[PDB]
Ligand code: SF4
């Protein structure tokens with residue numbers, strides 16, 4: 311499974327969904343997750359993310375390990391997203407800000 315980590319929060323560019331062959335992204339208010347059972351590990355999404363927030367599960371940074379289980383959980387409750395849309399309004403003000411998990415909205 312690939313995993314969306316911290317820098318996606320309050321950015322949510324959604325360029326990542328265009329390239330997904332199996333449509334395994336699920337949408338929240340200010341974040342996207344990858345559904346771990348559905349992802350086929352084709353890796354096509356991770357050089358598409360402007361925020362460089364997508365990682366292979368086995369390559370998630372130490373200090374972002376919480377995001378593996380978070381992706382799995384929220385992929386259960388959030389609606390599937392298959393079409394790109396506009397980035398959130400202030401997305402590049404927030405691109406690169408660390409510790410954005412305190413800002414995650416359900
Ligand atoms: S690695 Fe491939 S299958 Fe998994 S989320 Fe990214 S684009 Fe979709």
Ligand code: F3S
Pocket residue numbers: 314317318319321322323324325326327341342358359360361362363364
């Ligand atoms: S910011 Fe998030 S919505 Fe996709 S393009 Fe990057 S993982």
